């Protein structure tokens, strides 16, 4: 399954003036473009090698679309402040996520077009791409206006047409990068706890994509209900890391095995410390 997704953030900042406006595009959870109103000459920019084949009409049109979007978001921030009757000198956030999930056959799996105001759901295009979930009265007011403007029809045209078409083009152009798999490299560490037992920590490093399953086993039985597990985190070079740990009796460490499952592995890994 594949996705094209844009993540848009507009932040009002009274007293310094005009909102900070950003726009980050991902293909299959891989960043490939960005826009930042705080650049000295703000414009759409490549953030992956493969998108750089696009002609300058692509970059000029995306720059203009971002700047146009920035205009709408400036208006929306004023509209929201009034509808929620918020104080005039404060900073507020309008977020927007839009995109398409498609199978290999190119069928649209799910289109998204949803907004949040100060961190909570505001309005969201439903999966039928004809109706809106509106969280409160201000967003219900927005929905009535969008219903009589035919917005859903026309956003759905983007999600079913231009979004799928460009995704399909991106997967051809960026095939070697997006479909790459990087297998985890794993090791187990050990540290005596002040309590008198032992922490075994199973590391997975250098893997892509981010989806991974780490489990500890004690003579073949899963210890999910007794393990610690960090949020998967970016290494900064395009790979990810994660670890999982268990607390074990000193002297029984060799009974415990780490299990690493990742799409880049031909067979799951099994590691011990003793």
């Amino acid at each position: 399954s594949h996705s094209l997704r844009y993540f848009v953030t507009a932040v009002s900042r009274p007293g310094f003036g005009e909102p900070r406006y950003m726009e980050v595009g991902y293909v299959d959870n891989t960043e490939f473009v960005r826009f930042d109103s705080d650049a000295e000459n703000p414009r759409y920019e490549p953030r992956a090698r493969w998108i750089e084949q696009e002609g300058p009409e692509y970059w000029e049109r995306e720059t203009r679309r971002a700047k146009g979007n920035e205009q709408s978001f400036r208006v929306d921030l004023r509209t929201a402040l009034r509808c929620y009757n918020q104080s005039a000198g404060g900073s507020h956030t309008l977020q927007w996520m839009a995109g398409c999930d498609v199978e290999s056959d190119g069928r649209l799996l799910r289109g998204y077009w949803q907004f949040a105001y100060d961190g909570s759901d505001y309005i969201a295009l439903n999966e039928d791409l004809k109706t809106w979930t509106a969280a409160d009265m201000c967003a219900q007011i927005t929905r009535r206006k969008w219903e009589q403007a035919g917005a859903a029809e026309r956003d759905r045209a983007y999600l079913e047409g231009e979004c799928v078409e460009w995704l399909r083009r991106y997967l051809k152009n960026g095939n070697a990068t997006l479909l790459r798999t990087d297998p985890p490299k794993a090791h187990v560490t050990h540290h005596r706890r002040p309590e008198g037992d032992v922490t075994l920590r199973c590391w997975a490093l250098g893997f892509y994509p981010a989806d991974i399953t780490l489990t500890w086993q004690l003579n073949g039985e899963e210890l999910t209900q007794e393990m610690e597990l960090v949020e998967t985190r970016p290494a900064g070079d395009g790979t990810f890391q994660k670890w999982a740990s268990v607390v074990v009796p000193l002297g029984k460490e060799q009974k415990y095995t780490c299990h690493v499952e990742h799409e880049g592995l031909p067979e799951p890994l099994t590691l011990r410390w003793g």
């Binding site: 844009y6 146009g68 709408s72």
Partner: peptide, 10 residues
């Protein structure tokens, strides 16, 4: 390519 708000404001 990304989506346009097209001055369809909230």
């Amino acid at each position: 390519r990304g989506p346009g708000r097209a001055f369809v404001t909230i």
